[PDB]
Amino acid sequence: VSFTARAKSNVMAYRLLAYSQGDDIIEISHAAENTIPDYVAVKDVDKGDLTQVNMYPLAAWQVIAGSDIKVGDNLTTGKDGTAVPTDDPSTVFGYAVEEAQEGQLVTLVIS
Amino acid sequence: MVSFTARAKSNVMAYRLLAYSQGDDIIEISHAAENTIPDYVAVKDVDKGDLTQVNMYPLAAWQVIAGSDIKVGDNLTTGKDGTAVPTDDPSTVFGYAVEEAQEGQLVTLVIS
């Protein structure tokens, strides 16, 4: 299924997103650093632009890497919605099954 | 989906949040207790001694009875009788509203 989201502030593709609420429609912005994100952008979305959130429960995501990620590394939110390695449970939202440099997309399995 | 047999043990009502327990060689189900995270959602009335089934599937969203007025984006938890109510305590949040609901109306929810 899917639902309407109103964005919040300059969403970039492949970045980790988080939801909020304001006037009514759920607001979407880049997820804060060191936590668990809610959604992955598939395309760029302007600040106040309405769009859809495609809830097709995925077991794995394709997310832009914020730093050097190795295979099996536990991942959390980094800066600007990027994904980074973490050694602190609770910030973990998944783990990499691929190796990635920086700014490259990395496949990760959500857990 | 993956279906399995489960027995109600306390008058299961449709669109209510459900919990389960280990019973007499069978999973027994009932309305989820207040202020927690439910496991299953009813979609049929099943009385206290009635035997039914559960259809397993990672559903994106559930449609349940609102235990109170709900605003879009509200984090929800169990309430009285297995209904869904607004909250703010993360540990009891099982999903959130994507649509408005008045008490007694269905509210679509997205699992987290």
């Binding site: - | 299953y40 979609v43 009335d45 259809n55 397993m56 269905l106």
Partner: protein, 49 residues
């Protein structure tokens, strides 16, 4: 506005769409109604996920 029907619903419903206008201590309820006939499926429901 999306009715979702239980897997063992067996009687005649009525949806209601209520616009509350008027006084806080006199709720003037304007209610539009529709009628739903529940027809069986014989599917194995129960619980999900």
């Amino acid at each position: 506005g999306l009715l979702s029907v239980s897997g063992n619903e067996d009687n005649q419903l009525t949806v209601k769409a209520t616009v509350d206008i008027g006084t806080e201590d006199k709720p003037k309820l304007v209610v539009g109604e529709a009628v739903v006939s529940i027809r069986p499926n014989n599917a194995s429901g129960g619980a999900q996920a």
